[PDB]
Amino acid sequence: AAQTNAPWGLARISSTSPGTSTYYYDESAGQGSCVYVIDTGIEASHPEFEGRAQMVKTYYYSSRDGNGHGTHCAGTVGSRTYGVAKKTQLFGVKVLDDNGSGQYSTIIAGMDFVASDKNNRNCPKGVVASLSLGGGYSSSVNSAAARLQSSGVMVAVAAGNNNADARNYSPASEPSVCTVGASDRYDRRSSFSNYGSVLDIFGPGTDILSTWIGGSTRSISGTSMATPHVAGLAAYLMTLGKTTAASACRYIADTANKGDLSNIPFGTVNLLAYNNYQ
Ligand SMILES: CSCC[C@H](NC(N)=O)C(=O)O
């Protein structure tokens, strides 16, 4: 399948070269997979989700996304126009308040929730979790992310936005999950992207158009935007049977475009997520 005039990031993950605008992908499109977006919520009523998004947990007085960040990330995973995996099921877990903030204890609880809740959901092709959040190093946060991965969920986490080594951020620094840096449309490391040996992969992160609250769209930047490209790609590849939740990060790195990015510090992987479709 071909989506013309797609957001640059979708085109980039289906291309061996920058500077194209069509997204090519197998029509299975992540059908039968599920992606949990652990964030500020998801505006599930947005027409772009077509009934495939659902809030399943909140730790606050409402499950509404009053911020927009979670809705934008969910749109990059799986919205019809702006999403990698256009037939996946999206589940929202609101661990962040409408200012984008949350206690580590709440974030940990949300990760434990996903590890159990996936047993109440029909996801025969596999389960992914997208975590576009983080803060300073916490062994407890890293352990929660490791538990979620171990339970059989492909966990993708943002590297962080401090132009610093991600070894000092969590869950970014947890080795067993997939840590995602950000690139721009000219194949440069995004100026804010964390780096370091803990990174596993880069995805599009600068100037990413996706869904927003109030039934709108907008373009924003961050490793928060690169992460759902990788999460959606994992769901897509798991639906095709190419990989599993346990192996998907390694598979994405093995099949990535290699050596295409500039401004990559010595010791950081030069790998850009790629779907290998055509
Ligand atoms: C009609 S929406 C197209 C959005 C635009 N796409 C590309 N390829 O530049 C962008 O990513 O900004």
Swiss-Prot record:
Enzyme class: hydrolase
A GO-annotated cellular component: extracellular region
Catalytic reactions of this protein: Hydrolysis of keratin, and of other proteins with subtilisin-like specificity. Hydrolyzes peptide amides
Record-annotated disulphide pairs: 34-123, 178-249
EC number per UniProt: 3.4.21.64
Residues reported in the UniProt entry to bind Ca(2+) 2: 16, 260
Catalytic site: 39 (charge relay system), 69 (charge relay system), 224 (charge relay system)
Binding locations of Ca(2+) 1: 175, 177, 200
The protein's role, per its UniProt record: Hydrolyzes keratin at aromatic and hydrophobic residues.
Name under which the protein is recorded: Proteinase K
Gene: PROK
Residues of the full protein shown: 106 to 383 of 384
